[PDB]
Design a protein around this ligand. Structure first.
Ligand SMILES: *[C@@H]1O[C@H](CO)[C@@H](O[C@@H]2O[C@H](CO)[C@@H](O[C@@H]3O[C@H](CO)[C@@H](O)[C@H](O)[C@@H]3O)[C@H](O)[C@H]2NC(C)=O)[C@H](O)[C@H]1NC(C)=O
Ligand SMILES: *[C@@H]1O[C@H](CO)[C@@H](O)[C@H](O)[C@H]1NC(C)=O
Ligand SMILES: *[C@@H]1O[C@H](CO)[C@@H](O)[C@H](O)[C@H]1NC(C)=O
Lengths: 231, 132, 231, 118
């Protein structure tokens, strides 16, 4: 029906680990059939796949395609033009996608368990937290010693923005529940965070016991024949 | 030694704390926590008479000393709601280590009076079981 | 396309803080916005007024209604039986709703701020974690002293389900950033959580600087041959 | 010379010991390792070459070497050293700073007090 505004960038979960970056840009508005027109102004040896449509709001269709151009033009600042055309009105609002600027780093904290859960001998719980990062894309993984845990042992919420003073920032949490015998053995755990405003793309924090231990302890044993209790 | 965090009487433990702040180097202060335990050397494990030997092992968990469950009042928008303050006090079943000076403790013993036997009641702390 | 009928539950906020438990009844997937009639089987305050035939897939018809009636029967486990009889179908169809059983009550924990965030003297973070509850509805408020903070000063995530230890349970989190002056001075902060399985429907946790990790610990054990009465 | 890391004293398999030499002008240097009383073969440890250390003012050097011994004997209390030679040292002498492995104070007070709480 009426044309709208839509955006789709490359995926971070494949941009930080592998080099299988795929661009896929969107512009919709469905009244007519296939009248396909592109803008891929760098097209340096890429062939755009197209496929079948899928389900939409009871009759309408929408189209897109993929360019595999991971030769670092995206984190340089190419603008990668997106603009439709049809036998229709030649007045688009356009999409021009690039690596964005004014980026900030996250600040990561890893919290110890509550002392109520320790004195019950069941599973205990840990909490990761990151806040202050400027685009809302982030990855969170857990480790045990050096082994990465499978990603169906832990829960991670989404990425939401904060109340602030002018500059806008974002935050995210996650939890992991382990057994109390593993905590009281002395095994360590870690939270890893990936983001694109970090220079080495990863940060770590690690926790165990003996981390927030106090540094001074006075023990006095008062024997018999010396009781002096006051009310 | 200024602000009382807990003063418990089933286990007879008391915990106070105090902030004492230096003015130079405002990044580091000290926070003190004082604990006092009084160990009874002549009480039984269950509190009746013939139970078991002297209790010789005494266990204190900080999360059960500081536990607070009597309800409170919170004002949210313009409303008074009653809230609980703890997860863990499901009703007792707590084993006490000492007596409490304002509660009184009795036992039941059978004795004979020539014919059949009665169900004589006996005070265990006589200062507190006076009927008035 | 396809017309269906769906039924939503009452919201948590007006059930606890108030009692006005207005219900609703939604069918979607028609295109003729004049013919619709609904019917409930218990109807004493029967005047259930229908809602506007608002927007749909490119401006189609989609109508719902509201039955007023407050929260005494919903807690005892009644039933409600909305059905629709629109002229774009040849069948009246029905669903129902009931306050669910098989519920569990949550465990609330407040976490003290991290140590590294206090060394900079700008702002500090408090975290509220509530866990192990069987429905998918929860509330989180914050208080300073005995004064409730306004809702735009803290960020709360959504309710999601956690990995399976047999039966399904859920979780939620919340954060609040306060000034590092009145933390060190000694003000108190509270996290309140409301859910349907708790007996008084609310529970509270309060924290301040004294009830956290101390730096010094003094232990004094006094052995008493005298008596076991604890004056 | 440095004591071992904590994480090697967890599985108790082997224990590594680091010898650091830093900041000299002539760039010829030897390192010899020894446990107890006897010196060791040159093929029982790993040692690097010396590179110019980045520093303000004048140009100096550095070198490193490590050696891995067992866990239980370091729990026992045997002794090591690290004999680094040079040209400009009057005896070309060692440094033996090693232990088998907390601040404790224990007092008894008879406490003739007039009156206090407890
Ligand atoms: C600690 O010791 C006390 C004293 O024995 C225990 O309290 C009493 O335990 C008896 C033994 O089961 C209970 O007996 C019941 O007595 C009533 C008469 O009041 C009788 O009709 C019943 O048929 C039954 O035999 C009694 O409920 C109980 N409580 C009292 C007298 O107040 C106590 O249970 C012991 N605690 C532990 C943890 O062992
Ligand atoms: C990309 O499209 C937007 C749409 O308004 C426009 O504002 C922007 O200037 C375009 N980029 C360039 C380089 O023209
Ligand atoms: C209520 O729902 C159940 C299962 O969804 C089913 O028996 C029927 O749809 C309804 N029954 C009654 C009596 O309302």
């Amino acid at each position: 029906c009426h044309p709208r505004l839509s955006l789709h960038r490359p995926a971070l979960e494949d941009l930080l680990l592998g080099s299988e970056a795929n661009l896929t840009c969107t512009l919709t508005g469905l009244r007519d059939a296939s009248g396909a027109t592109f803008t891929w102004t760098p097209s340096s040896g890429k062939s755009a796949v197209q496929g079948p449509p899928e389900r939409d709001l009871c009759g309408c269709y929408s189209v897109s395609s993929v360019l595999p151009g991971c030769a670092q033009p995206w984190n340089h600042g190419e603008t990668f033009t997106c603009t439709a055309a049809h036998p229709e009105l030649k007045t688009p609002l356009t999409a021009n996608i690039t690596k964005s600027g004014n980026t900030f780093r996250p600040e990561v904290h890893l919290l110890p368990p509550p002392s109520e859960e320790l004195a019950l001998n069941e599973l205990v719980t840990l909490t990761c937290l990151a806040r202050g990062f400027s685009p809302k894309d982030v990855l969170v993984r857990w480790l045990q010693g050096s082994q990465e845990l499978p990603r169906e042992k832990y829960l991670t919420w989404a990425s939401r923005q904060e109340p602030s003073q002018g500059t806008t920032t974002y935050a995210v949490t996650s939890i992991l529940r382990v057994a109390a015998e593993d905590w009281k053995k002395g095994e360590t755990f870690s939270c890893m965070v990936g983001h694109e405003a970090l220079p080495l793309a990863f940060t770590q924090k690690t926790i165990d016991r003996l981390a927030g231990k106090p540094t001074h302890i006075n023990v006095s044993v008062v024997m018999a024949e010396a009781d002096g209790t006051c009310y | 030694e200024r602000i009382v965090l807990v003063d418990n009487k089933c286990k007879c433990a008391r915990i106070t704390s105090r902030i004492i702040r230096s003015s130079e180097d405002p990044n580091e202060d000290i926070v003190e926590r004082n604990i006092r335990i009084i160990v009874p050397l002549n009480n039984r494990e269950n509190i009746s008479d013939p139970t078991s030997p002297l209790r010789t092992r005494f266990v204190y968990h900080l999360s059960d000393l500081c536990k607070k469950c009597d309800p409170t009042e919170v004002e949210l928008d313009n409303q008074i709601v009653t809230a609980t303050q703890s997860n863990i006090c499901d009703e007792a079943t707590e084993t006490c280590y000492t007596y409490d000076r304002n509660k009184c403790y009795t036992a039941v013993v059978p004795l004979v009076y020539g014919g059949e036997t009665k169900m004589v009641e006996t005070a265990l702390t006589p200062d507190a079981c006076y009927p008035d």
